[PDB]
Amino acid sequence: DLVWSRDGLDWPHREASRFIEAGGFRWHVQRMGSPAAPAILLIHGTGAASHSWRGLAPLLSRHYHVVAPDLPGHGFTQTPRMSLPGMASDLAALLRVLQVAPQLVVGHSAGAAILARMCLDGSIDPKILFSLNGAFLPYGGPAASFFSPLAKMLVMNPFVPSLFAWQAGHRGAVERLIGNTGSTIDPAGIKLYGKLVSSPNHVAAALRMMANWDLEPLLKALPNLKPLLVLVAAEGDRAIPPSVAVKVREILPKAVIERIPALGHLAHEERPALIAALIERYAEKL
Numbered sequence: 001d002l003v004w005s006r007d008g009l010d011w012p013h014r015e016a017s018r019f020i021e022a023g024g025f026r027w028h029v030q031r032m033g034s035p036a037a038p039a040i041l042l043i044h045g046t047g048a049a050s051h052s053w054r055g056l057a058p059l060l061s062r063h064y065h066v067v068a069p070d071l072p073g074h075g076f077t078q079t080p081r082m083s084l085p086g087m088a089s090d091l092a093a094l095l096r097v098l099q100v101a102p103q104l105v106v107g108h109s110a111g112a113a114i115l116a117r118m119c120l121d122g123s124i125d126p127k128i129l130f131s132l133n134g135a136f137l138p139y140g141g142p143a144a145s146f147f148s149p150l151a152k153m154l155v156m157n158p159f160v161p162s163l164f165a166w167q168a169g170h171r172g173a174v175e176r177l178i179g180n181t182g183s184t185i186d187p188a189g190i191k192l193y194g195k196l197v198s199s200p201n202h203v204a205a206a207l208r209m210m211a212n213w214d215l216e217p218l219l220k221a222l223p224n225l226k227p228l229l230v231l232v233a234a235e236g237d238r239a240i241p242p243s244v245a246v247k248v249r250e251i252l253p254k255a256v257i258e259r260i261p262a263l264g265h266l267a268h269e270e271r272p273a274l275i276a277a278l279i280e281r282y283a284e285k286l
Contacts, residue, residue: 001199004028004076010191012054019076023093028076029069033061038103040279041126042068043091045109045135047206049075051192052108055272060279067100071114073205075196082208084218085121088114092123104283105227106130108268109240110209113218116229120221127286129227130279132268133240136222136248138215148211155211161204168197182236182264189269222251229255230282232275234267 002008004019011017016030030050040060044052050068057066070077072090080090091114095102105126107115112134118124138144154160168174174194178185196202229252233242242259249255258278260267268275 001201002076002195007195007199008076010188012051012188012192013057016057017050017076020094020097022097023080023090025072025078025080027069027094029067029094029098030057031068032057032066033064035065037063037065039100040064040066040104040106041095041100041102041115041124042066043105043107043111043114044068044071044074045107045111046209047074047196047203048108048193049196051075051189052266052269054189054269056106056268056275059272059276063280064104065100067098067102069094071111071209073208074202079201079205082205083212084113084117084214087209088117088121088123092118092121095124102126104128104130104279106132106279107134108132109135109265110213112136113215116222116225117218119225119227120218126227128282129225129229130282131229131231131245131248132275133234133237133265134231134248135240135244136215136219137244138213139210148214151207151211155204155208158204161200161207164207165198165200165203168203169194173197178266180238181266182234182238183266183270184264185266185269219251222248225252228282230258230278231255232258232260232267232278234260234263234265236262236264237267239265 016032020027042053049070053068060066073079105115112131231245233245235242245257
């Protein structure tokens with residue numbers, strides 16, 4: 001459904017967009033800053049896209065080479081195993097084509113788990129892994145053991161994404177969905193998300209990912225994570241509460257927690273300068 005020349009005309013930082021063949025399919029990838037600077041890799045969360053970084057990317061491009069892809073199936077990246085190790089290896093295939101060796105990495109929500117998996121595979125070795133409300137525990141809870149096979153049934157049905165996409169197209173629906181995570185974003189941002197949730201293929205992509213998401217193996221391997229793990233926890237985050245970060249730190253005592261009052265799940269979209277300053281703080285110790 002989503003076609004660059006038709007649907008992507010008001011996409012932010014359009015100049016930075018390029019469409020790259022890697023791992024057997026075509027990626028939409030945004031790059032900013034000088035290609036010779038230390039590279040920072042930005043991985044968005046489930047159901048979002050590179051536009052999520054529209055605020056933060058220009059600030060980081062001063063000092064770093066910013067690389068921000070749409071994950072498989074999301075946005076204007078096409079659909080290819082829509083799983084955690086599947087995505088981590090597909091991303092590694094993109095980085096090789098691009099010839100990028102990131103010094104820093106930033107993951108929002110599920111993006112943080114993907115990046116952790118890439119580190120553990122050995123396919124990258126950043127100095128710091130920044131986790132913005134990283135979704136390191138299963139969604140909801142151990143109720144997942146029960147919600148897992150049912151969701152795979154929902155996924156297997158092509159009609160579900162069309163229904164969700166149709167429902168999410170109604171006025172007030174996107175601002176409501178985003179409001180439920182505890183965040184408030186600009187009108188332009190709401191419009192962009194609205195375009196995404198209204199595309200069945202995009203929605204289907206996000207749903208497959210949720211259904212095939214198993215975090216048990218990662219949590220087992222997490223203790224051997226080499227990079228510094230900076231766990232940013234927005235306290236207004238209703239989707240991924242700050243307790244998740246505490247639980248990750250219980251498994252990896254070396255991890256560090258940065259609490260931010262009030263802001264919601266999309267804190268980096270609400271206040272990108274705040275997140276930029278934090279990233280800068282930490283990098284300067286190196």
